[model samples]
Target: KTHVQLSLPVLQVRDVLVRGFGDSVEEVLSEARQHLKDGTCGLVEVEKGVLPQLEQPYVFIKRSDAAPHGHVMVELVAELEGIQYGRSGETLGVLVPHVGEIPVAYRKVLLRK
Candidate 1:
């Protein structure tokens, strides 16, 4: 229902083990570190915006383990999960609650307010 296009600083980021490539690591580890190194990683400065909203976008951020804060524009519409269920169309795919995201499973749901 509501499409949000706001740029927020990245919060934190986590790594995922790829299938068939989980055993082979360090290379992937370096990439993960290098990835956020150029991005937000730790340095972030975004004003307080309620901190958390169960029915808002940030819910996915706080609830999930993906990096939140990077500037993005996502369509806030789930049609199932009560509108805030999913956010798609911009940086990440449809960000959902219980799960986190759709289409792209680990893109990190972000921002709020």
Candidate 2:
């Protein structure tokens, strides 16, 4: 298996139906619509411990240096088809391409509240 990191928590849904309109914004919106049809594609929570592992080369290189450092890194491994925010509790849905995978998490508490 491989490992990946994320800068921001992401949610992804695979096998989402895609539609395009003139290969522009319209097309993108169309895709977003399809994802929202059913709602709540999937849910993922991110924590420091369960984060994916870095690739092997990184491990080897760090080991060779005589000192290995585990730095927190974020990688864009997937994308949420769409995102919705409302009252304290709201349902959000996302979609991802069949060929890609995206991780997701939920943040209910307001940062400035």
Candidate 3:
């Protein structure tokens, strides 16, 4: 069997910087990275008498307009991982808490529209 390797940044996705009318991509990534760095974003396997370790891990990024009751759609699926039971079955899927994104405000600078 041959091995496949990715030469690009493993966690990177194109257009990740693109967001909704009032969302900030940079803000989300910044917070997400902090969680990942602290190992708070993935499953933790503690020694247990053992039913395939309970795996509860999930990650996603969403964008939304700041208007009341506005629709907030998923702008990016950053990363996800879950528990595997048996040698085949799957486990839990945890949704990471939504990190509030910075709102984008248009300045009064005139530009060709």
Candidate 4:
């Protein structure tokens, strides 16, 4: 039996446009932390211009955890629960509701011979 443990952060990607919202960076990050703790997804608001220029929508995720290795491995989840989409002919910029969790992972990076 072998088990590897790794401490990392998680990030959930959402297909939605976040703009013209009053949520601040700190607030959004805090919410994200809470979501992580609660095993849920967080929401963020960004300027329209900051979103992806293509037809695909974009949502931003912030990491509040401090990585001892100077870099944190993030597990990016593209699909989330409660995500809704309009008709197939609908535009891609439409905002949808979504949520996800960022959980830790365990792995062995190095092994001694």
Best by lDDT: 4
The estimated TM-scores of all candidates read 0.19, 0.23, 0.21, 0.27
- Which 10 residues in a row give candidate 2 its minimum summed lDDT? 55-64
The residue ranges of model 2 lying beyond 4 angstroms of the native Cα positions read 1-9, 12-22, 40-104, 107-113
**Prediction 1 global C-alpha lDDT:** 0.27
Cα deviation in Å at residue 61, candidate 1?
A: 11
Q: Encode model 1's per-residue lDDT on 1-113: one tens digit a residue.
A: 23222332332222111211112233323332343334422211123432222122222222222233553432222222243444344223212212121122233334332
Candidate 1 clashes: the total is 4
What number of backbone clashes does candidate 2 have, counting pairs of residues 3 or more apart or in separate chains?
12
Q: Rank by TM-score, descending?
A: 4, 2, 3, 1
lDDT tens per residue, model 2, 1-113: 13321122234322223211123334333443343233322223323432232111110000111111342312111112332122222212222222233444432211110
What are the clash counts of all predictions, listed in order? Answer: 4, 12, 0, 0
C-alpha lDDT of residue 39 in model 3: 35
Error of 4 at 36 (Å): 1.2
How big is the positional error of residue 5 in model 1, measured in Å on the Cα after superposition?
A: 12
lDDT scores in order: 0.27, 0.24, 0.25, 0.28
